[PDB]
Amino acid sequence: QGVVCIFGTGDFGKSLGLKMLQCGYSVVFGSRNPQVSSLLPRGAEVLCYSEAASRSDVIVLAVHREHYDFLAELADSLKGRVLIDVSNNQKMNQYPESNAEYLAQLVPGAHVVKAFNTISAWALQSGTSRQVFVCGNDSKAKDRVMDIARTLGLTPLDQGSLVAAKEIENYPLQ
Ligand SMILES: NC(=O)c1ccc[n+]([C@@H]2O[C@H](COP(=O)([O-])OP(=O)(O)OC[C@H]3O[C@@H](n4cnc5c(N)ncnc54)[C@H](OP(=O)(O)O)[C@@H]3O)[C@@H](O)[C@H]2O)c1
Numbered sequence: 001q002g003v004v005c006i007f008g009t010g011d012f013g014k015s016l017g018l019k020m021l022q023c024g025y026s027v028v029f030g031s032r033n034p035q036v037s038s039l040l041p042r043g044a045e046v047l048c049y050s051e052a053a054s055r056s057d058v059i060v061l062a063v064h065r066e067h068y069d070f071l072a073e074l075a076d077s078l079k080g081r082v083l084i085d086v087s088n089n090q091k092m093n094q095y096p097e098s099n100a101e102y103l104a105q106l107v108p109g110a111h112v113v114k115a116f117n118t119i120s121a122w123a124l125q126s127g128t129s130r131q132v133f134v135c136g137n138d139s140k141a142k143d144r145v146m147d148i149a150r151t152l153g154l155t156p157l158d159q160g161s162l163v164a165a166k167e168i169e170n171y172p173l174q
Contacts, residue, residue, distance in 0.1 A: 002026070007062055011122070057080075082141045087099040088169060114133070114169075131157060
């Protein structure tokens, strides 16, 4: 399989990265501090966000909505890439716009696809629902994310356009 980029090196990023390496992807991490990488897998490459962006066409945004802001200055080197929003909020109606729609405007030249938000960090390793709700405004971007979902052992369901994102984000809260 090809290359995938994971922005962020926390619980979700690490867990997905490891699973993706195990399924045959090459993985590149984007990080604020790529000189700290002890807990990251020897097979992944670890770079600054700007450099990680240019290494792949698919970028998993393993960051919380609260720290999306840095993407605004990168939005030029994210042009034409797939950006997977995996985010949840801590509580219902915490924001008037869906996180994935907010990202879509922070980065107007990327194709945003919502996916993976209902998978717990480390559930891909423990082998303990396989369903993944996917939405987005571009079918080529969505189909690419759905293929990733299947290669990881998951069952993706196309819920429509990015307007479906709010309900997908609400799902683990309710
Ligand atoms: N944890 C879960 O079980 C889970 C499940 C489903 C979905 N998600 C979603 O996955 C995303 C990441 O969650 P997490 O649990 O992995 O969060 P986390 O452990 O706190 O990691 C967040 C990552 O954000 C990056 N980041 C970029 N800018 C940051 C800033 N200004 N402040 C702090 N971190 C910054 C950091 O990577 P660097 O330091 O390398 O820059 C950090 O490792 C969230 O959107 C969450 O809702 C999480």
